């Protein structure tokens, strides 16, 4: 959302966009890491090193950081009862956002929203099944995980019942009207017997479209298109509530959450194509006139809906962006069940691996690998700067403790939680999240180091 | 039309209905015909052949002052109790001399 007209800084926008499209957790850390590799390459440029020689030295240095990151990695997620590694992984992503008041409540929402929609046989998660809706009012603690769908209810009759206990949902895609063809007709009326046949044709058509729903045993109808006024009163006489003007992908989520089928016509309705749902009701929020749908009970649904509430639209649109990062880190655990320990613990441990292999051998790329290890320490020392500590005082203590003994999950924190052990503080990050942070920042540095000319124009006109 | 044989009977009917009115308002003795509408070039033939004066596109305020002063009746269409073309020929105006100077 910047208006930066600089082609070097425009590549940093696409770098943070590429992290969001692939993983979606380290979009902030991939820009500080790329700016750290270029700052260490500035002093290497004054010493006479070629910029491609620094870029070839960063590839031999980032390869050590990938292989060292795969040393300690284990998870015991079974998606049945061992959701405790899944909650603590989402708390690391949600801990940096403004949802720390709901740090335990909203973390359990994003865990159960993924496991109910993910295909564990293919390890594929579809985010189209997870509907993220937001409405102003209430508080952040009123955010609930609604198993089902939440749409804008548009009961055409104001005397419609606003609560269905056991809903046999009849999903249809045909408007409540006489059937209009797709071509030009220009139907001819000649005598008065043909005009009286027009009245009996539509009178029996509205009685046919209503009886074919009641013969299937349905007590709720969903329609994509509009309703006629003559069809509205026939819904109240037959005790058949129905909504009007639902969107495109909204009714696609109803047929999965209720187990029904979307029927094109009225003649193809049957008892097997009906959906099953429990508490179907509309809830008015304060003084507004929205009346969104709340689906409490279901039966083996593969589609959930998160209803985010708040005090203003600034806290809701951020929570839509904060919880989407929490939905992505659970998706990355199904793609790869290996984790690391964040809080700067993985960056200090990877900086020691490049420094150990810089002496094996220090032929040409010795200075390029030490500039990579000094730039990997910028991310944990930025956590020490934002926490009110000292960067060079705190980083020297943590890095020295990993050499004197075997290197544990040793990082830092804000309130510091007592000890600096990341295994005890439950700061868990994904392996492929930090694996793509080092891989994308190295390749973006190589495309901005291997450039020796700028051919930009002058004024606009 | 659904048959090409009935094409020329409709094309000639647009002028035969027109010439039907012009022959029953002229055979009753009318010599001066004033019209506030429009007399096209086809209808001007029936007055030159019969020797009648036809004045076209006159004012609506001038027609009322002539018909009231000469005893004529300001007629707009066909009338008089489901008649085809009657024109009520006893309600024609009179004049001593109509001369263009």
């Amino acid at each position: 959302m910047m208006d930066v007209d600089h082609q070097i800084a425009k590549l940093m926008v696409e770098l943070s966009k590429s992290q969001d499209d692939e993983i979606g957790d380290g979009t902030t850390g991939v820009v500080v890491l790329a700016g750290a590799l270029l700052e260490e390459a500035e002093q290497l440029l004054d010493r006479g090193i070629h910029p491609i020689r620094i870029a070839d030295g960063y590839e031999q240095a980032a390869r050590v950081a990938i292989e060292h990151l795969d040393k300690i990695s284990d998870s015991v997620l079974v998606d049945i009862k061992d959701t405790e590694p899944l909650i603590q992984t989402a708390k690391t992503t949600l801990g940096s956002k403004v949802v720390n008041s709901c740090h335990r409540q909203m973390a359990e929402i994003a865990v159960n929203a993924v496991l109910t929609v993910a295909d564990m046989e293919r390890r594929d998660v579809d985010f189209e099944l997870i509907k993220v809706e937001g409405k102003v009012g209430g508080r952040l603690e009123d955010t609930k995980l609604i198993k089902g769908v939440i749409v804008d209810k548009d009961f055409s009759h104001p005397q419609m019942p606003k609560k269905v206990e056991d809903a046999k949902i009849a999903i249809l895609t045909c408007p409540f009207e006489p059937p209009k063809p797709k071509t030009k007709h220009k139907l001819d009326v000649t005598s008065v017997e043909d005009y009286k046949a027009l009245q009996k044709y539509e009178k029996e058509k509205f009685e046919e479209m209503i009886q074919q729903i009641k013969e299937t045993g349905a007590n709720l109808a969903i329609c994509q298109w509009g309703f006629d006024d003559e069809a509205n009163h026939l819904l109240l006489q037959n005790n058949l509530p129905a909504v009007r003007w639902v969107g495109g992908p909204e009714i696609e989520l109803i047929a999965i959450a209720t187990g029904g089928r979307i029927v094109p016509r009225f003649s193809e309705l049957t008892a097997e194509k009906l959906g099953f749902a429990g508490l179907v009701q509309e809830i008015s929020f304060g003084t507004t006139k929205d009346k969104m749908l709340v689906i409490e009970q279901c039966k083996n649904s593969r589609a959930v809906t998160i209803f985010i509430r708040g005090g203003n639209k600034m806290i809701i649109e951020e929570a839509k962006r904060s919880l989407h990062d929490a939905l992505c880190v659970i998706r990355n655990l199904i793609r790869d069940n290996r984790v690391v320990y964040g809080g700067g613990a993985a960056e200090i441990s990877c900086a020691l691996a490049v420094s150990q292999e810089a002496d094996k051998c220090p032929t040409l790329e010795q200075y390029a690998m030490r500039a990579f290890a000094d730039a990997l320490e910028v991310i944990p020392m930025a956590l020490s700067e934002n926490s009110g500590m000292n960067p060079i005082q705190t980083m020297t203590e943590v890095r020295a403790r990993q050499v004197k003994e075997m290197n544990p999950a040793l990082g830092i924190d804000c309130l510091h939680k007592g000890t600096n052990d990341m295994k005890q503080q439950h700061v868990i990050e994904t392996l492929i999240g930090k694996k793509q942070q080092i891989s994308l920042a190295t390749q973006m540095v190589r495309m901005i180091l291997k450039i020796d000319d700028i051919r930009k124009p002058g004024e606009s006109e | 039309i659904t048959d090409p044989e009935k094409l020329d009977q409709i094309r000639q009917r647009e002028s035969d209905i027109t010439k039907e009115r012009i022959q029953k308002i002229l055979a009753t003795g009318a010599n001066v015909i004033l019209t506030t509408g429009g007399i096209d070039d086809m209808c001007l033939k029936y007055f030159v052949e019969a020797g009648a004066m036809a004045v076209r596109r006159v004012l609506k305020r001038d027609l009322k002052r002539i018909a009231k002063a000469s005893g004529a009746t300001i007629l707009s269409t066909l009338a008089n109790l489901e008649g085809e073309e009657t024109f009520e020929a006893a309600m024609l105006g009179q004049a001593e001399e109509v001369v263009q100077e």
């Binding site: - | 039309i1 659904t2 048959d3 090409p4 094409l7 409709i10 086809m42 033939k45 030159v48 052949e49």
Partner: protein, 99 residues
């Protein structure tokens, strides 16, 4: 084109060729009505099609095409003719003899 909303629905194969023949026969109907008085010079104010020139060619008739309206009223007094607007309503007094 007539002063109406005439539109023909052509369903059979013989209907389109019949309309193009009725357009030729309509010109031959009015050209046969003007040669019953045996004229020599036909003078009009509007256009003359090539099919109307074909019947006047073999009947040895000299046709003038686009004479003005003010020139037609002047030749009507010189030759003693009457300007008619209907070919099937021609009479012997409408022919300008004495020229």
């Amino acid at each position: 084109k007539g002063e109406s909303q005439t539109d023909i629905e052509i369903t059979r194969e013989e209907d389109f060729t019949r309309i193009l023949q009725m357009e030729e026969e309509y010109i031959q109907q009015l050209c046969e009505d003007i040669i019953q008085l045996k004229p020599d010079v036909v003078i009009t104010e509007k256009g003359i099609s090539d099919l109307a020139q074909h019947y006047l060619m073999r009947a040895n008739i000299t046709a003038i095409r686009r004479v003005r309206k003010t020139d037609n009223n002047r030749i009507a007094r010189a030759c003693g003719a009457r300007i008619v607007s209907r070919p099937e309503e021609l009479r012997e007094d409408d022919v300008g003899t004495g020229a």
